[PDB]
Amino acid sequence: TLLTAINERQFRNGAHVEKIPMRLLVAASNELPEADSSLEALYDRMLIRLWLDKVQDKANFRSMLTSQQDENDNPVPDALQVTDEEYERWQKEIGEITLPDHVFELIFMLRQQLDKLPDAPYVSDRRWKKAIRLLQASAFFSGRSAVAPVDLILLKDCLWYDAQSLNLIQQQIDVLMTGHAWQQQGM
Amino acid sequence: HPHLLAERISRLSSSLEKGLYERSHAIRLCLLAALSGESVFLLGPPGIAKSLIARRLKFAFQNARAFEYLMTRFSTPEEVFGPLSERLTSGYLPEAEIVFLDEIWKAGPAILNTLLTAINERQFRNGAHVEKIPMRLLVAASNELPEADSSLEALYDRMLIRLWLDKVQDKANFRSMLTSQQDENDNPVPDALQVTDEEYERWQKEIGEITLPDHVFELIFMLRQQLDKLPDAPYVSDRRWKKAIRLLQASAFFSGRSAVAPVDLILLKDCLWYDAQSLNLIQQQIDVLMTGHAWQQQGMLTRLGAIVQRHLQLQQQQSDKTALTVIRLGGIFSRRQQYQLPVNVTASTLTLLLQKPLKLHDMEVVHISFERSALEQWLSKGGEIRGKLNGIGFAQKLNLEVDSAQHLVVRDVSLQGSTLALPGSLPGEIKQQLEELESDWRKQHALFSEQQKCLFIPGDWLGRIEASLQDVGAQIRQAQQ
Ligand SMILES: Nc1ncnc2c1ncn2[C@@H]1O[C@H](COP(=O)(O)OP(=O)(O)O)[C@@H](O)[C@H]1O
């Protein structure tokens, strides 16, 4: 039932179906699912995959250990809160972002590079198509009208899937970001 | 009326391809099975639009309900066919036109047993009384292949169409796919192209009424017997052959034809295979029959050789009129040097016939093709010479020698003499048989130019049928020179 709420955004309520206004879906755990199980369907549909950990800086640990801010309060002012009309209007302007020819040469190069390495994780067409929706919205909320080459850094938390693919995805993207992104290696 | 049906089918599948690139062979194959009562199997990695094709086929009908479900290792029949109270089957499987089951190679024994009765009997055990199921299309996708000795082989043998989908490969088709603004949950099919419930029930009766020509039966029986002799060929049972006719007869009905066309045999490349080993053998065995016995390609090649053999037989029979005189030359030399004819012969790989045939290398021959570059050295310097038999094989050594009347004598193992002769400067019998064979090539090529516009035929396969028909017409035109 969780797969139909993401693609169709509906729910089988006995007889008639109704839409679900799900704007954000977060899933946390601790371990990784099996490589040959039924739980791989939900993992392949989740776009962003973050690997959170504990704090490491000493200066950031003192202010965190003694924080008087309530976790169940409202620390966001009313002037910065978006309305329901602004959320429905932004969904139409996200897909209207133009795709420059320079950005397409970087996506096709990174996709072909992972198909040659045996230890590289397989990226399906669903992961590539859904990554554009997050990349186009990154430039829309930043003051841009087209896809910028700097938005390719967000792919480091989407292509990976386990501990072995984390060190390979962050390494292959860093080469393209410091080589073919701004014509570094081309020059 | 039958000609106008091909326009509506070609326009219906065109609207279904909006937003799905490099998936033309998957949409047209699922549309034919949805209008004929068959099934379809999809194989590939998860993430190649394997679930959108199941939700897109429900838009072609006026009243069609979709059903998406993922079969797990601990799945229960109460979650697929609806739980009981007599069974709450409101929107599940017994009352669904198109059902989608992902990863079917891992379900339970209770769900697999109930799924076999919904295809053959098209019913469901609803506690006491049974009710029919209006299932018009059944699609099953996964990622891996079932075991060779397991209970999951019963459902795989019943699935007719087996497609092996993969990711995109073209660079131009990837840019438009990566940035597609078409909604996947919308309705991109107009109301004028959507079929009704009355048209679906009427087409099921006209599918079985398609006549089976005698020329098509000779191709099905030949392909079935060819797979029974190869050990690495997949076994095709009687259920697979019988169900393949329902998809072949409906392919010509929706294209403007009343009988089974030989071009419909290309659809068997996604039904006979079952694994990675049978994929390279099924596509290869069908391509030979499609470019050999489908349009009489190989049938005319063996008939053309009989005309060439008959022309060489009549030339060696009348060889007593033209002999072979070798002129002499003067000069100062220790050996008797001989010279060939000047302008009378100018070809390099010329052929020379003979009168009485002999047995050379434990085989018969009717003409020996010599080389002009090696004949000048043997007639002057001497030594040994080589030459192939019947214009084929390697240049074998022969017992060539000169005669008292300036002629060439070829001996064998019994010291039998044979005077060689050159062919003179088209008989009426050869031209009559060549004109009849050329007329059959034009009639066979006209049939391909009237049925290649089928929607259920891939585009890359048309390049091999046209290239195979042109090779036969080019070989018959060289003999009449
Ligand atoms: N080859 C393709 N061509 C066009 N669109 C595709 C392709 N593969 C995937 N998509 C798009 O990705 C979206 C999600 O596909 P998904 O259902 O995850 O595929 P699968 O069922 O194979 O996992 C679909 O809406 C589809 O439009």
Side-chain angles (χ1 to χ4, degrees):
Chain A
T1 55
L2 265 171
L3 295 168
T4 54
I6 304 171
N7 308 323
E8 298 186 7
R9 240 81 183 179
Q10 285 164 354
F11 177 68
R12 321 155 206 166
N13 208 306
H16 279 283
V17 283
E18 51 186 32
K19 53 108 176 178
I20 300 173
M22 188 181 81
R23 299 174 174 160
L24 173 79
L25 167 87
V26 53
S29 171
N30 191 20
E31 57 213 69
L32 298 158
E34 306 283 319
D36 282 325
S37 170
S38 298
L39 264 306
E40 272 194 326
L42 191 49
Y43 197 35
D44 288 331
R45 295 192 190 277
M46 285 195 284
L47 182 61
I48 308 154
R49 288 110 161 264
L50 290 157
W51 203 330
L52 268 76
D53 214 332
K54 66 184 196 295
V55 285
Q56 305 289 127
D57 185 51
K58 190 167 184 178
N60 287 334
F61 182 62
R62 200 209 208 275
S63 311
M64 167 256 155
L65 201 66
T66 47
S67 182
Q68 276 163 313
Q69 169 91 303
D70 200 289
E71 53 264 78
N72 296 347
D73 269 359
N74 193 201
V76 181
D78 287 38
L80 300 180
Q81 290 191 323
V82 298
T83 76
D84 299 329
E85 195 178 53
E86 284 172 340
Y87 173 73
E88 301 292 325
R89 193 172 69 246
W90 287 340
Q91 288 319 293
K92 185 195 171 74
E93 277 163 338
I94 276 160
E96 281 152 27
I97 299 292
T98 60
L99 197 273
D101 291 342
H102 189 244
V103 191
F104 175 65
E105 287 300 315
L106 289 172
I107 301 163
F108 198 82
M109 186 175 176
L110 187 71
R111 181 181 179 233
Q112 288 267 253
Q113 257 267 23
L114 297 181
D115 205 46
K116 294 191 83 173
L117 303 170
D119 292 331
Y122 159 70
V123 197
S124 71
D125 294 352
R126 181 221 296 112
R127 192 142 293 267
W128 279 117
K129 198 196 184 186
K130 275 159 91 164
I132 308 299
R133 196 180 178 85
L134 199 81
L135 256 52
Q136 285 176 295
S138 182
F140 173 68
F141 288 120
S142 286
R144 295 191 298 264
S145 42
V147 182
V150 86
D151 293 313
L152 256 63
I153 323 168
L154 281 177
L155 300 180
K156 76 168 187 66
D157 299 292
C158 296
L159 305 187
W160 78 276
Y161 74 103
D162 68 324
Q164 199 266 331
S165 60
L166 175 68
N167 294 335
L168 197 139
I169 285 311
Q170 294 222 352
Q171 190 220 338
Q172 280 300 288
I173 293 175
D174 187 90
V175 169
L176 194 84
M177 279 316 287
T178 59
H180 299 257
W182 273 275
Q183 220 65 41
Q184 299 102 320
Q185 206 188 333
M187 283 194 290
Chain B
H1 313 289
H3 328 101
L4 287 163
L5 185 63
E7 171 88 65
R8 190 197 185 170
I9 295 304
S10 205
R11 279 200 138 97
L12 175 65
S13 174
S14 186
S15 69
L16 292 159
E17 220 179 315
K18 274 162 188 156
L20 296 173
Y21 294 91
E22 302 197 13
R23 295 298 184 270
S24 67
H25 198 244
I27 292 156
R28 285 143 189 229
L29 256 294
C30 287
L31 184 68
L32 188 56
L35 301 164
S36 62
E38 287 291 329
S39 61
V40 62
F41 168 67
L42 270 79
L43 173 65
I48 42 179
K50 280 199 302 289
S51 75
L52 189 51
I53 50 101
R55 272 165 308 208
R56 268 279 157 85
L57 260 297
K58 79 159 166 170
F59 296 123
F61 312 98
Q62 281 193 147
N63 182 47
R65 317 168 174 200
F67 173 72
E68 188 202 306
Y69 197 88
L70 174 87
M71 287 288 169
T72 82
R73 293 178 201 206
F74 325 104
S75 289
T76 69
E78 271 69 44
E79 307 152 33
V80 186
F81 312 101
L84 79 159
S85 62
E86 67 174 64
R87 203 159 204 169
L88 297 158
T89 66
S90 194
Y92 279 96
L93 203 136
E95 35 182 292
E97 271 72 29
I98 287 98
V99 282
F100 177 69
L101 310 172
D102 209 338
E103 224 73 38
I104 209 64
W105 317 121
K106 51 162 63 166
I111 319 164
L112 197 273
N113 272 284
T114 55
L115 265 171
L116 295 168
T117 54
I119 305 171
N120 307 323
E121 296 186 6
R122 238 80 182 178
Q123 285 163 354
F124 176 68
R125 322 156 206 166
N126 208 306
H129 279 283
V130 283
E131 50 186 32
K132 52 108 176 179
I133 300 174
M135 188 181 80
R136 299 176 175 160
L137 173 79
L138 167 88
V139 50
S142 169
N143 190 20
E144 56 213 69
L145 298 158
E147 305 284 319
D149 282 325
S150 169
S151 296
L152 265 306
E153 274 193 327
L155 192 49
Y156 197 35
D157 288 331
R158 294 191 190 276
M159 285 193 284
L160 183 60
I161 307 153
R162 288 111 160 263
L163 290 157
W164 203 330
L165 269 77
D166 213 332
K167 65 185 196 294
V168 285
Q169 306 289 127
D170 185 50
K171 191 167 185 178
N173 287 335
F174 182 62
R175 200 209 208 275
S176 311
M177 166 256 153
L178 201 66
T179 47
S180 182
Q181 276 163 313
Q182 169 91 304
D183 200 289
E184 53 264 78
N185 297 347
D186 268 359
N187 193 201
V189 181
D191 287 37
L193 300 180
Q194 289 191 323
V195 299
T196 76
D197 299 329
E198 195 178 53
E199 284 172 340
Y200 173 73
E201 301 291 326
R202 193 172 69 246
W203 287 340
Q204 289 319 293
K205 184 194 171 74
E206 277 163 338
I207 275 160
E209 280 152 26
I210 298 292
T211 61
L212 197 273
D214 291 342
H215 189 244
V216 191
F217 176 66
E218 287 300 315
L219 290 174
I220 301 163
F221 198 82
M222 186 175 176
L223 187 71
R224 181 181 178 234
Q225 288 267 254
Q226 257 267 23
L227 297 181
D228 205 47
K229 294 191 83 174
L230 303 170
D232 292 331
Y235 160 70
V236 197
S237 71
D238 294 353
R239 181 223 296 111
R240 191 143 293 267
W241 280 117
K242 198 196 184 186
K243 276 159 91 164
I245 309 298
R246 196 180 178 85
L247 199 81
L248 256 53
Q249 285 176 295
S251 182
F253 174 68
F254 288 120
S255 286
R257 295 190 298 264
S258 42
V260 183
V263 86
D264 292 313
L265 256 63
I266 321 168
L267 280 177
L268 299 180
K269 76 168 187 66
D270 300 291
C271 296
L272 305 187
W273 77 277
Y274 75 104
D275 68 324
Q277 199 266 331
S278 62
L279 175 68
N280 294 334
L281 197 139
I282 285 312
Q283 294 223 352
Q284 190 220 338
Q285 280 300 288
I286 294 175
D287 186 90
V288 169
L289 194 84
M290 279 316 287
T291 59
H293 299 257
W295 274 274
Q296 220 64 41
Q297 299 102 319
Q298 206 188 333
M300 283 193 290
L301 280 170
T302 175
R303 256 222 276 160
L304 182 65
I307 308 162
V308 182
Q309 203 60 230
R310 193 87 175 96
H311 190 256
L312 273 156
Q313 178 161 137
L314 295 178
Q315 280 281 307
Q316 73 104 22
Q317 275 172 212
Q318 298 292 323
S319 67
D320 314 337
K321 198 116 163 205
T322 301
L324 198 136
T325 317
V326 168
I327 50 157
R328 286 199 180 198
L329 56 93
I332 313 296
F333 210 74
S334 159
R335 269 183 158 268
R336 281 176 195 186
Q337 291 186 130
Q338 309 277 348
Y339 214 65
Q340 73 271 9
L341 293 99
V343 86
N344 301 113
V345 278
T346 45
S348 62
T349 84
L350 78 158
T351 63
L352 295 173
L353 316 154
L354 87 161
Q355 276 76 241
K356 179 179 183 292
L358 301 183
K359 205 159 198 171
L360 297 174
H361 299 262
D362 206 71
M363 89 186 88
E364 55 99 18
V365 72
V366 291
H367 66 108
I368 314 167
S369 71
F370 289 89
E371 184 185 10
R372 220 194 87 97
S373 168
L375 196 53
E376 293 173 50
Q377 283 188 228
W378 180 86
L379 284 161
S380 293
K381 270 85 194 168
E384 280 151 17
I385 209 170
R386 317 182 73 108
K388 57 182 72 177
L389 310 175
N390 288 319
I392 42 164
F394 272 128
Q396 297 299 109
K397 298 222 173 213
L398 306 169
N399 200 0
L400 191 62
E401 49 168 282
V402 82
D403 212 348
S404 61
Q406 306 302 306
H407 298 317
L408 300 180
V409 179
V410 177
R411 321 213 84 99
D412 38 21
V413 291
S414 301
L415 304 158
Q416 299 267 21
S418 191
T419 309
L420 293 180
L422 78 154
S425 51
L426 191 62
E429 189 189 5
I430 308 300
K431 199 164 178 285
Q432 175 63 51
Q433 287 162 197
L434 221 46
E435 273 170 7
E436 287 178 53
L437 192 63
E438 199 203 312
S439 177
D440 290 322
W441 179 84
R442 285 189 190 270
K443 286 167 177 179
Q444 278 307 306
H445 195 252
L447 287 155
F448 171 65
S449 59
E450 220 195 63
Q451 69 192 241
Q452 90 274 23
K453 42 102 177 181
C454 187
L455 202 70
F456 321 103
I457 297 298
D460 50 354
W461 275 84
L462 262 75
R464 263 167 268 130
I465 310 294
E466 187 67 38
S468 73
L469 287 167
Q470 283 301 314
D471 206 295
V472 188
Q475 277 191 236
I476 191 175
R477 278 166 200 164
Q478 198 175 1
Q480 41 199 17
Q481 293 295 325

